Design a protein around this nucleic acid. Structure first.
Ligand SMILES: NC(=O)c1ccc[n+]([C@@H]2O[C@H](COP(=O)([O-])OP(=O)(O)OC[C@H]3O[C@@H](n4cnc5c(N)ncnc54)[C@H](O)[C@@H]3O)[C@@H](O)[C@H]2O)c1
Ligand SMILES: NC(=O)c1ccc[n+]([C@@H]2O[C@H](COP(=O)([O-])OP(=O)(O)OC[C@H]3O[C@@H](n4cnc5c(N)ncnc54)[C@H](O)[C@@H]3O)[C@@H](O)[C@H]2O)c1
Lengths: 203, 203
DNA sequence: ATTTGAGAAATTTATCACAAAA
DNA sequence: TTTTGTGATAAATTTCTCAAAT
């Protein structure tokens, strides 16, 4: 499966949830492409990699395709997350997941600063000492670790998660993590610098 | 300019700053590829698009190439940013830029909630009423707007920024913004769902 | 002795076109 | 009356060679 497909699959997934909220039961690839700003052929091709969910001369059943993509994306289950780093980013993600997301459940947040190791970072979430990270991940079968520590300590924390059996890592620190589990990176500063690149190109 | 180049250029830029902090004056493309986990040929190709910064049989002057990429990225200037939305994401980005970044200066943050209007979101940064957004952007020549409002209000905020002369937008809301200025998106939930995709694929 | 950079090839991704179903 | 889905084309991206500098 081509690399850019997974990203577009997530976009189709959110769009289908919107159509369900609107009451739409059937949608064509051209109607989907019209509101995502993509070519209908690309949408049909990407879905081709995983199966035949369409009805020739009719379209796609919104609920069936939504459920199908959800199964492919692994979203049909609840994912247990831990946040390492109770700073700006760590608390922002903790307060959001507990509130807005129902498929991702943050059950722990960790820090190394004695001032924060006792404070509450989100509703029903008390900051734990990072010394307990491995024990917590193994005991509660945590599956996703979000790294929100400075770059100088991201790799070390990444290896502890992988050692404790983490299945994947969401990395916010501006460094390339080296581990055997999947890693998605969110580099805010890199995005700004990609933005300035495009800005000066237009000028 | 191929699409993936700008992203890798930002990666070379951070790596070169690290080499400067280490005292390295000259570096080969193979040494750069060694610390970025890329092929040396790719690094040389990407640099080819913008000029000839290397010394045949020698390598690249670290400081000269750093300055060259910095000029291409548009980082040799100070960029004025405003944050719309003083929530979790908005406050996290405000406190970081004011503290950690020297090339991006957040000079304003805006919200529509009377409870937060007037409050301080970061050192020396007081939340302003979003009704003043356009006026602020025009007067102070703000160049980059960071959108940290719920998805239902992202497009409307994007159009006000573009109307006030904003040059680019960093978008955190899970929706595709439609404007004539460049837009870089950071979709945290989409990243998690791309991560779950990779997790269930491997296993 | 090395190491960059300019074609050329190889690889990957997007787009098209149309028969096949409903 | 139409729209999905498969092959094939087309386009974009990555990788490879190696002459030319040093
Ligand atoms: N906040 C932003 O907008 C932003 C922007 C760009 C990049 N980043 C990057 O995201 C990451 C976190 O950003 P932030 O704003 O939250 O910084 P922050 O200083 O507010 O929070 C970092 C937290 O990590 C803790 N920490 C440090 N070492 C630790 C360790 N071994 N174990 C456990 N905890 C540890 C610290 O106690 C601190 O609380 C950083 O790598 C940063 O470079 C953030
Ligand atoms: N916090 C996360 O980790 C996370 C994760 C996924 C997605 N997001 C998305 O990022 C965006 C912001 O996230 P958040 O956690 O900070 O939400 P938040 O509730 O913590 O803060 C959002 C702020 O936007 C303000 N607002 C609403 N409408 C406004 C308007 N017209 N003008 C000005 N201000 C307005 C609100 O007063 C609020 O303070 C959202 O779109 C969210 O879906 C965030």
């Amino acid at each position: 499966i081509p690399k850019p497909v997974s990203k577009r699959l997530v976009s189709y997934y959110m769009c289908l949830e919107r159509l369900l909220d609107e009451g739409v039961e059937v949608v064509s690839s051209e109607e989907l492409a019209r509101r995502l700003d993509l070519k209908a052929s690309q949408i049909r091709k990407d879905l081709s990699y995983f199966g035949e969910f369409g009805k020739r001369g009719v379209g796609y059943n919104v609920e069936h395709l939504y459920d199908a993509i959800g199964e492919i994306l692994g979203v049909k289950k609840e994912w247990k997350l831990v946040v390492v780093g109770a700073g700006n980013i760590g608390r922002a993600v903790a307060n959001y997941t507990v509130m807005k997301e129902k498929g991702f459940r943050i059950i722990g947040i960790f820090d190394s600063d004695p001032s924060k190791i006792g404070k509450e970072a989100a509703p029903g979430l008390t900051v734990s000492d990072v010394s307990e990270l491995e024990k917590f991940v193994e005991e509660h079968g945590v599956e996703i670790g979000v790294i929100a520590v400075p770059a100088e300590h991201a790799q070390e924390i990444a290896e502890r998660l992988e050692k404790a059996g983490i299945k994947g890592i969401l990395n916010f620190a501006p460094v390339k993590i080296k581990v055997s589990v999947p890693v998605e990176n969110i580099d805010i500063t890199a995005s700004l610098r990609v933005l300035t690149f495009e800005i000066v190109r237009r000028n």
